[PDB]
Amino acid sequence: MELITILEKTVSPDRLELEAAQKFLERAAVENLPTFLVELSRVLANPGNSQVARVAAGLQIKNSLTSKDPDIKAQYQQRWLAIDANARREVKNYVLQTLGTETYRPSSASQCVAGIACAEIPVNQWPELIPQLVANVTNPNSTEHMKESTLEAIGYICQDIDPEQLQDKSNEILTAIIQGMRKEEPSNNVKLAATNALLNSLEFTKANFDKESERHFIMQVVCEATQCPDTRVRVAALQNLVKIMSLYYQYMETYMGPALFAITIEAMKSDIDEVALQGIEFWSNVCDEEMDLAIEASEAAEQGRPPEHTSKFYAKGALQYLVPILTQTLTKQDENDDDDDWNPCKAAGVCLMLLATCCEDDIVPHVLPFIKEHIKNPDWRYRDAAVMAFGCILEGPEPSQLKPLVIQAMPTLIELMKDPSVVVRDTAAWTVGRICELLPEAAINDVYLAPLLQCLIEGLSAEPRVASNVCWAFSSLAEAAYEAA
């Protein structure tokens, strides 16, 4: 046989032609291990080769070097390791020159490079790599690919190793990553890749950020790229700014107000779902981190001593400007409605809750005016939001200021049970339950108890969820009895 048209078939559209050559060219795995890899390493290089051949090329080399399951990986790793220092030094060259000549998109080359990568360095057998890639981007005379392709590699390399191995390559690596994100940089495809690389790298550079010289610099570059026109890179930029926020909360005090708040609070109002999600996550993650510190304080306050680390209270401020987005976002909900998807309607509801449990008795006021103001609106959308928001804000706040609140709505909430809109129903049912779990007393009220239960029952023969919610309620109410004795 002749090795090209086979690779063409090594991934063909038919499950038998492929399954065939997928093994034929697997006999030379354990009976030709070396000799093979190389063969491809060149065909993967010479541009003359049709797409498939090339694409399929690295696919095989990539394949036989690494594994998905963190298990077998160990095995297929030492593989190219215990190999002959003859062909390795050969392949490692027919590939570092394949980039810039591949027309396709996710260029296979990046793949294999990274694969070999997690092994030619955890000991240091390929310490000439990093300087070479660096040259691909920092060098102004390089193809839109020559650059892209490269980064792609750098990114996989990070996404596959434990922090400890890359912690001292940072300076060398990062210097390149960021170069791909710069504003003056032409192709957004290079920018993109780069912004991704960062997402996988932030994880191991406490050293880098600790040096103000760089930090300032990184944050500048990330925020700039947050103003890039290509949606493709904005979602990348925010993802970093979100990761960074969970990662380096303490250092963010110098960027939050001048640069970050304006940026993240803006995004949330993006018509684009992907871009909003990111924005919400940010302030969502911020609460998480902040109310977590909130603990550090007390647990270390009763014991009588300085809190190891201190919060800076961002949610509290922006609270005013947040909610009136979170709430207004509790409207961009999917029609057909999928239950496991992650669209703003959720993030908003979720974050609207977390905030409600960190800011405490400060949220009650900023949210009410939206409920009263949307309990009657025609569009069900602005209606269920009203309910939902009332549902969210029941954790955190002191009951000695909710019990009274609910009661006034409690009644006009029951009427929402059989609200002509199917979504208002479901949500109205969900709240009720949440109003039994959190606040037991203020629910069992004669004034509207009799009219209550008689509507919960009525719900048992309704839609699953709803019914499967009246339970979250009846149950709760009962437990509230075994507790009062």
Binding site: G155, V242, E281, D339, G349, V350, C392, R434
Partner: peptide
């Protein structure tokens, strides 16, 4: 073809499970 990622998910305390929301979290 299945390249790397786009990852960024969350929902704290019973993460990617869905439903309207979850239950309380308490202390000492």
């Amino acid at each position: 073809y299945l390249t790397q990622e786009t990852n960024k998910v969350e929902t704290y305390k019973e993460q990617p499970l869905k439903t309207p929301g979850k239950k309380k979290k308490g202390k000492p």
